[PDB]
Amino acid sequence: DSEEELKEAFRVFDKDQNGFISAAELRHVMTNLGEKLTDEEVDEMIREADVDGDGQINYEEFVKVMMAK
Ligand SMILES: [Ca+2]
Ligand SMILES: [Ca+2]
Structure with missing residues (x-):
């Protein structure tokens, strides 16, 4: 289930x-990702x-952003 996979991603981000999902939390996830984004x-x-x-x-919002942009 693609939707189920999306929720897994959501759980990963949070x-x-x-x-x-917080910028701080998102910042840490991106950091672990091996990716370095600016503030x-x-x-x-x-x-x-x-x-x-x-x-x-x-x-819900993540779904809207993830589904579109
Ligand atoms: Ca949170
Ligand atoms: Ca919001």
Whole structure:
């Protein structure tokens, strides 16, 4: 199930594992990834993906961002 795989990815991104992805958490995941992004790229991606501006991306939102852009 592709959708199931997406949720696995979501679970991977959420280190805190509270059903939310934070720039800090996302930053750490990208760091482990062996990829080194700047704070601005990380923030811009997060803000671009932050629609409620809440500063965090929930799964539903992650799905919308992951499904599209
Ligand atoms: Ca979180
Ligand atoms: Ca949000």
